[PDB]
Amino acid sequence: SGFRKMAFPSGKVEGCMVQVTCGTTTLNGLWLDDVVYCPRHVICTSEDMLNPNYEDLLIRKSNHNFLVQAGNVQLRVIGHSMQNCVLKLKVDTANPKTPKYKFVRIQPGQTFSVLACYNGSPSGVYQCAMRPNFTIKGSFLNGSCGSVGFNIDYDCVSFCYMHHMELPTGVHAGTDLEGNFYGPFVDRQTAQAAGTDTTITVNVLAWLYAAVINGDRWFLNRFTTTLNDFNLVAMKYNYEPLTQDHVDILGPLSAQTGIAVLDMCASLKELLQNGMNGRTILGSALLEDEFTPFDVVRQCSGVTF
Amino acid sequence: SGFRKMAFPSGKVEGCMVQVTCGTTTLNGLWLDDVVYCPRHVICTSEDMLNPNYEDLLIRKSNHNFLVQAGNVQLRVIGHSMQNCVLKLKVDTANPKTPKYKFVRIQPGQTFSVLACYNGSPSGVYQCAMRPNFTIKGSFLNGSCGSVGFNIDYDCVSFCYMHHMELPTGVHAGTDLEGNFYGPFVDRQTAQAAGTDTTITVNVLAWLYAAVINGDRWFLNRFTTTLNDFNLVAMKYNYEPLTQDHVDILGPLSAQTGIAVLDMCASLKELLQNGMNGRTILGSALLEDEFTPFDVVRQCSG
Ligand SMILES: *[C@H](O)[C@H](CC(C)C)NC(=O)[C@H](CC(C)C)NC(=O)[C@H](CC(C)C)NC(=O)OCc1ccccc1
Numbered sequence: 001s002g003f004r005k006m007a008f009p010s011g012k013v014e015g016c017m018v019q020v021t022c023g024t025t026t027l028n029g030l031w032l033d034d035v036v037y038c039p040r041h042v043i044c045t046s047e048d049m050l051n052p053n054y055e056d057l058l059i060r061k062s063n064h065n066f067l068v069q070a071g072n073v074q075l076r077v078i079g080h081s082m083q084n085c086v087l088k089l090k091v092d093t094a095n096p097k098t099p100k101y102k103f104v105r106i107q108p109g110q111t112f113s114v115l116a117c118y119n120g121s122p123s124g125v126y127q128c129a130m131r132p133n134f135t136i137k138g139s140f141l142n143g144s145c146g147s148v149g150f151n152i153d154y155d156c157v158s159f160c161y162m163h164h165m166e167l168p169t170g171v172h173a174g175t176d177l178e179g180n181f182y183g184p185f186v187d188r189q190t191a192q193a194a195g196t197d198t199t200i201t202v203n204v205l206a207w208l209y210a211a212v213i214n215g216d217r218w219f220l221n222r223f224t225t226t227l228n229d230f231n232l233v234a235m236k237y238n239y240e241p242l243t244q245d246h247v248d249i250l251g252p253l254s255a256q257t258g259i260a261v262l263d264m265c266a267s268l269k270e271l272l273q274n275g276m277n278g279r280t281i282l283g284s285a286l287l288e289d290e291f292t293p294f295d296v297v298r299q300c301s302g303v304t305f
Numbered sequence: 306s307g308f309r310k311m312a313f314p315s316g317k318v319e320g321c322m323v324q325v326t327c328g329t330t331t332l333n334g335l336w337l338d339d340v341v342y343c344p345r346h347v348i349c350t351s352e353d354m355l356n357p358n359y360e361d362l363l364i365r366k367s368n369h370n371f372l373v374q375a376g377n378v379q380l381r382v383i384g385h386s387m388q389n390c391v392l393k394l395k396v397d398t399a400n401p402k403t404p405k406y407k408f409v410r411i412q413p414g415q416t417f418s419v420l421a422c423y424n425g426s427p428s429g430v431y432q433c434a435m436r437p438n439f440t441i442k443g444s445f446l447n448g449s450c451g452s453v454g455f456n457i458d459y460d461c462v463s464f465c466y467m468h469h470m471e472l473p474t475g476v477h478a479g480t481d482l483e484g485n486f487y488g489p490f491v492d493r494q495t496a497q498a499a500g501t502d503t504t505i506t507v508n509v510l511a512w513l514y515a516a517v518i519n520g521d522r523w524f525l526n527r528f529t530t531t532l533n534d535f536n537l538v539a540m541k542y543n544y545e546p547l548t549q550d551h552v553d554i555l556g557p558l559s560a561q562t563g564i565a566v567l568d569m570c571a572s573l574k575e576l577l578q579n580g581m582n583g584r585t586i587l588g589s590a591l592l593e594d595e596f597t598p599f600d601v602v603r604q605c606s607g
């Protein structure tokens with residue numbers, strides 16, 4: 001037993017991380033087959049980070065202007081192209097360590113593992129969620145751009161995130177691997193702010209199921225609620241409305257534990273209205289919302305990759 | 306910026322995980338050079354787990370009673386021996402993915418990453434601290450024994466933990482890679498309990514510095530304290546004593562932030578006696594004690 005904020009094993013992604021240097025700027029790229037993907041702002045200049053004409057800046061560059069490395073193995077770039085806010089740099093060497101992969105664009109509320117890197121060297125791994133406002137709360141320093149976020153399924157790595165920027169508040173914004181930002185942000189240092197951060201209700205309920213599974217039962221009660229009455233209380237605390245789809249995906253956890261979804265909603269209603277009264281749930285004093293129902297089943301059933 | 310509970314990249318350890326089966330007990334082993342390390346309780350029988358005599362249980366065993374699988378590949382056991390609470394299975398193939406590594410003994414308060422595995426395959430990676438009572442708070446199911454904990458130092462994998470058991474409360478216990486337990490535990494299903502858990506004071510202070518570095522400073526005050534007066538408060542709240550060595554270790558963070566160590570101690574004292582009044586620090590409503598001073602520096606600057 002035990003329940004922890006758990007990342008995917010990173011070995012398959014580690015073997016795809018490289019370092020990309022354009023002039024002074026250095027960041028991380030993802031090496032898959034004969035292509036390296038990285039954030040396009042690697043071409044920017046010191047005094048042109050407000051209104052960069054990325055098209056015009058790139059056509060003026062050349063293949064050699066991009067210095068790429070597999071740690072201690074330099075890569076020759078033999079072609080470059082822009083796709084939205086990412087660059088595709090063709091190289092003469094296919095990555096022998098390329099995994100089975102696909103590019104996916106995740107939905108708010110879903111989770112992924114971030115492999116934080118610097119100078120193409122993996123530094124740490126942690127689990128993040130896509131917030132309802134299309135930001136993530138990560139840990140990213142200068143040089144971390146190009147770090148990727150991913151999931152694993154069987155043997156296939158689904159890449160969903162590339163890191164590009166930090167907004168004031170310490171929240172992080174990036175693109176999918178097609179180069180399109182999550183949310184309305186742009187890769188310019190013009191003033192931008194995130195929208196309302198709401199709590200992912202379906203995930204809080206999943207984590208309450210995880211707690212029961214791992215022996216914390218004190219918040220269970222003998223009340224029930226209707227979904228209608230639960231949602232009127234959720235709204236007041238800036239929780240996502242709980243939909244029938246959410247009830248559906250909580251089904252398996254409800255069946256494993258013997259606690260109906262709306263009975264767990266009644267527990268959450270009480271926790272919202274009255275707090276924890278100095279107790280804790282799975283070592284936390286707050287209601288945690290960065291575990292999905294699948295994350296709970298995955299960890300509690302011990303599935304491997 | 307940002308501050309998260311961060312594990313080390315696990316790839317170098319993934320290439321070392323194998324599956325070990327004896328009878329109907331399956332757990333994980335660590336394949337380094339031509340040796341596979343695994344908990345010795347892989348040889349117990351279902352009916353003989355309260356009080357196994359491991360010397361007697363080995364009397365029967367042959368090399369071929371140990372089925373070792375590296376993924377699909379089958380590894381041939383050519384010798385076996387017992388060392389403390391681990392087995393060493395000599396196999397006929399050296400692991401071609403063996404990293405540069407060392408076996409290290411960690412002390413309470415220190416942190417490491419765990420790669421949780423089942424059937425020799427990885428499930429997930431997370432960060433743990435060795436608690437003062439010599440347990441860890443992990444996520445381990447049946448079949449997870451032999452999963453290891455480690456730190457990565459530049460090019461070197463330092464293995465410090467191998468998982469063997471769970472005490473009630475969801476509390477985890479194991480050995481180092483020499484096979485000697487952390488704490489007073491034995492690999493026996495006889496009743497055992499960890500000492501009451503206490504909070505790693507020096508680590509809380511480090512995390513408070515991480516918070517300041519990352520823009521959370523509402524808990525800083527005008528008060529100061531003495532080491533002695535702070536420890537009177539620590540004891541009452543079941544915190545570990547803070548020593549002068551701990552103060553020395555917090556020096557670099559104190560110099561980076563301009564907040565004297567005993568001034569941060571005064572902030573912690575007020576948080577202990579007053580709570581957070583509905584506020585949070587680095588996204589937490591509790592005082593976190595599983596980041597070391599070195600963890601903070603590494604994450605905030607690296
Ligand atoms: C890439 O490694 C790096 C990672 C961050 C964690 C710093 N990102 C950038 O350097 C990035 C480059 C631009 C051209 C996309 N800029 C930012 O992320 C930037 C950092 C701040 C702290 C200066 N933030 C930013 O431009 O946000 C928009 C903004 C601008 C002005 C006021 C509010 C918000």
Ligand SMILES: *[C@H](O)[C@H](CC(C)C)NC(=O)[C@H](CC(C)C)NC(=O)[C@H](CC(C)C)NC(=O)OCc1ccccc1
Binds near residue numbers: 346354448450471
């Ligand atoms: C190894 O895969 C597995 C991992 C655990 C997370 C289940 N560990 C064991 O099977 C281990 C083997 C023994 C011989 C060391 N036993 C335990 O860890 C055992 C688990 C419970 C579920 C029985 N714990 C145990 O015996 O703790 C001591 C104890 C015994 C009786 C009463 C209180 C405490």
Ligand SMILES: [Cl-]
Binds near residue numbers: 589590591
């Ligand atoms: Cl908390």
